[PDB]
């Protein structure tokens, strides 16, 4: 499956699975199903409380470590320069891993000093080999300008809620301007977009599912797209989004919903 | 006691409810059963979800009097139209195993304006016939609302939209209030991420409440009906316990400032 090349020369798959709001057993099952299906990009977070579960599914998968792309995140209670560096290490211990592929600040917050410090900490985390790449979630233009101007180190990724009713055109421009990759989560709009008349028309034109169209659109925007879990049958279906492309007109239609 | 909102048609709905979007029949039956046992009475389903029969099985199985339960379902987009929406409402009732629904909604306006205007006229008949106590819409913008109100003279009771502190819909809530339309929020946790937002966590700590409880309480204090995505029996019972505390004006202001 296709990759994007990050500004630090590392690569990520353009699709992954997220495990937010999953219990330990649900998380472990979901990751294990996704890996069997062909997913390699796994999105977790310390705040989810299920890193150990995800680590267990990874270890049992029998897939080589270097083919898996593990993302986790700094929990908000652990924000800060010194504390973030310890937090990343604590996540590794829970995951049973020697490194993660991508490590993210989960939220900037209104205290600029805290997220600036967190970013300086994550810079040390990358330097130390603890994370291959570093990035952020839900940073606006001003938040990005602040870390770039004060630290001189640009995030690899900015993770944001993105779907045709919230297409994030403005922020994608800002992201791309800094050579930051946009990572989309919530690609289905809380399930509602699966019945959107424009989505259904395009799905029917291609003989694909509504979810497939939603995902393919996001991929064609240049996004890395994270699907929530899921079920073995739907997981396999969602991954099957590289055998068709949406036309310019189809893109324009979906682009006009926001 | 779970408080209600009073709709423009004089009917009332509980201020909190559970949704079964993206659930299998098995999951929906389990989630609705759990929610009802925990004290939820407002249930949000849709024809497009394909789990109406499962939801209806759970409602029937509960033994709770029908008149204490508030069932919402929705017109699937393939069924839009004046004549077809009236048939669709009845097909939903048959799947739900019910004689009426409390709230019946157009799922999406769509680019075909004639289609949703006709759907709206059909739903007016559905309400006239007693098949739905109240009728409304999802994801209608100001132009969509002006189109249906100007052409049909009948105002929706509810406008259901995604709404959380990173997408607070202040503008659409103003549009809705101008028409005396109740805003119904879904995705109140922002795909789960808001559970770890520093401002939410500080306010949760101030109250000795969970982050989810603060997020739902905020939405309630905005005047919304708030639908929670289906969760575990432990979580859903916790999420329902949002009426023994109140966010201060400062706390509201903080959570209101997150979407900029």
UniProtKB/Swiss-Prot annotation, chain A:
Which residues are listed as membrane-spanning?
Answer: none
The answer to whether UniProt assigns keyword Ribonucleoprotein to this entry is no
Class of enzymatic activity (EC top level): oxidoreductase
Q: Where does NADPH bind?
A: 186, 188, 190, 226, 228-230, 234, 237-238
| Gene3D superfamilies found in the cross-reference section | NADP-dependent oxidoreductase domain
Keywords attached to this entry: NADP, Oxidoreductase
Does the keyword section mention Transferase? no
Checking CDD domains in the record gives: AKR_AKR5H1 (cd19134)
Superkingdom of this protein's organism: Bacteria
Catalytic-site annotation from UniProt:
48
Q: Which InterPro entries match?
A: AKR, Aldo/ket_reductase_CS, NADP_OxRdtase_dom, NADP_OxRdtase_dom_sf
How is the quaternary structure described? Monomer.
Please give the function described in this protein's UniProt entry: Catalyzes the NADPH-dependent reduction of dicarbonyls. Exhibits narrow substrate specificity, with preferential activity against the dicarbonyl substrates phenylglyoxal and methylglyoxal. Exhibits weak activity with ethyl-2-methyl acetoacetate. Cannot use NADH. May play an important role in the detoxification of methylglyoxal.
Q: Which family does it belong to?
A: Belongs to the aldo/keto reductase family.
Q: What is this protein called?
A: Aldo-keto reductase MSMEG_2407/MSMEI_2346
Q: Which organism is it from?
A: Mycolicibacterium smegmatis (strain ATCC 700084 / mc(2)155)
From Swiss-Prot, chain B:
Question: What EC number(s) would the UniProt record show?
Answer: 1.1.1.-
Entry's Gene Ontology molecular function annotations: aldo-keto reductase (NADPH) activity
Q: One Pfam family this chain carries?
A: Aldo_ket_red
Instruction: Give the binding site residues for NADPH.
Output: 187, 189, 191, 227, 229-231, 235, 238-239
Q: Which SUPFAM superfamilies match?
A: NAD(P)-linked oxidoreductase (SSF51430)
Q: Which InterPro entries match?
A: AKR, Aldo/ket_reductase_CS, NADP_OxRdtase_dom, NADP_OxRdtase_dom_sf
Q: Indicate the segments annotated as coiled coil, or none if absent.
A: none
Protein activity control: Inhibited by the antituberculosis drug isoniazid (INH).
**Which keywords does this chain's UniProt record carry?**
NADP, Oxidoreductase
What residues make up the catalytic site?
49
Assembly and interaction partners: Monomer.
Q: Which PANTHER family match?
A: 2,5-DIKETO-D-GLUCONIC ACID REDUCTASE, NADP-DEPENDENT OXIDOREDUCTASE DOMAIN-CONTAINING PROTEIN
Can you tell me which family this protein belongs to?
Belongs to the aldo/keto reductase family.
Q: What does this protein do?
A: Catalyzes the NADPH-dependent reduction of dicarbonyls. Exhibits narrow substrate specificity, with preferential activity against the dicarbonyl substrates phenylglyoxal and methylglyoxal. Exhibits weak activity with ethyl-2-methyl acetoacetate. Cannot use NADH. May play an important role in the detoxification of methylglyoxal.
Q: What is this protein called in UniProt? A: Aldo-keto reductase MSMEG_2407/MSMEI_2346
Lineage per the UniProt record: Bacteria, Bacillati, Actinomycetota, Actinomycetes, Mycobacteriales
